[PDB]
Design a protein around this ligand. Structure first.
Ligand SMILES: Nc1ncnc2c1ncn2[C@@H]1O[C@H](COP(=O)(O)OP(=O)(O)CP(=O)(O)O)[C@@H](O)[C@H]1O
Ligand SMILES: [Mg+2]
Length: 282
């Protein structure tokens, strides 16, 4: 495994902590990184470390490598979880990213639901403005990703992180690129599912589902519809209903992201424009 000296971080300066999240390509662990942030080279920084699980396969290691390299290409942005360094030599591969203390977006929202709908934070109940602000931030992050020639391909509320300052951060770049068989079906545009094509306009379709996840405060898309039956219903023009806490203005935005003709969906730029207007009148 070849070293990248710009990004390499000394293992002895990294202290691993509690698990934060896990799946079947790797796990995420809280850690402390002494000197990783060279704007403050003396300071310990709380970070997140992505690493293989004990039952990892070779493909898992390959995928983790690809994810690290994709995050080097992406760059830095307010609304994107950023790469801080890596441990690649003499030990397990550690990909060190910024820490988001309030967890993933789906799970921030569900804990901040109104009454009547172990983890609840009722003190921080979501307002309608919080939701549009959430959406504005994520549209900003996607506008930047597209400007850097990057398709995310796995946009979803579970792949958004929330910092201690409630800043939305797009995360999990394991599927990102400059088949499509590994993309979650309920978030995918039909041209991605059917024609094996992925553009920025496919990400705009996923953004619409993400919008729906947000205005349901973390609901599950196409509820009661199994993935197997979703292929047919999309080809017949089915779309999700308006969430209650969603304006019709914002509902038409979702529907514009879900246009059958991809070149006809909004751009992330236009979505940022529109959301900025809506956010200003709340
Ligand atoms: N920088 C971070 N700070 C705090 N928590 C994080 C984090 N990164 C990830 N997590 C937590 O771990 C969860 C999984 O993160 P992530 O989406 O990167 O892994 P993953 O989905 O590729 C696992 P797999 O591919 O094995 O199924 C997140 O939803 C989040 O709750
Ligand atoms: Mg994920």
């Amino acid at each position: 495994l070849p070293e990248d000296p710009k990004w390499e971080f000394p293992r002895d300066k990294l202290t691993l902590g509690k698990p934060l999240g896990e799946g079947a390509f790797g796990q995420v662990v809280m850690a402390e990184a002494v000197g990783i942030d060279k704007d403050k080279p003396k300071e310990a920084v709380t970070v997140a470390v992505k690493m293989l699980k004990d039952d990892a396969t070779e493909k898992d290691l390959s995928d983790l490598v690809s994810e690290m390299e994709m995050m080097k290409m992406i760059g830095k942005h307010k609304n994107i979880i950023n790469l801080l360094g890596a441990c690649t030599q003499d030990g397990p591969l550690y990909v060190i990213v910024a820490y988001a203390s309030k967890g993933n977006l789906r799970e921030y929202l569900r804990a901040r639901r109104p009454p009547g709908m172990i983890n609840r934070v009722p003190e921080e109940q979501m307002t309608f403005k919080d939701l549009v602000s959430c959406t504005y931030q994520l549209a900003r992050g996607m506008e930047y990703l597209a400007s850097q020639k990057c398709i995310h391909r796995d946009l979803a509320a579970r792949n958004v992180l929330v910092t201690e300052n409630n800043v939305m951060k797009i995360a999990d770049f394991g599927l990102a690129r400059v088949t499509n068989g590994r993309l979650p079906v309920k978030w995918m545009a039909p041209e991605a599912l059917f024609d094996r094509v992925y553009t920025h306009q496919s990400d705009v379709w996923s953004f619409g589902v993400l919008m729906w996840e947000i205005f349901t405060l973390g609901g599950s898309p196409y509820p009661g519809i199994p993935v197997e039956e979703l292929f047919k219903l999309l080809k017949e023009g089915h779309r999700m209903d308006k969430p209650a806490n969603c304006t019709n203005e914002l509902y038409m935005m979702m529907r514009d992201c879900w246009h059958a003709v991809p070149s006809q969906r909004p751009t992330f730029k236009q979505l940022v424009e529109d959301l900025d207007r809506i956010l200003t009148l709340t």
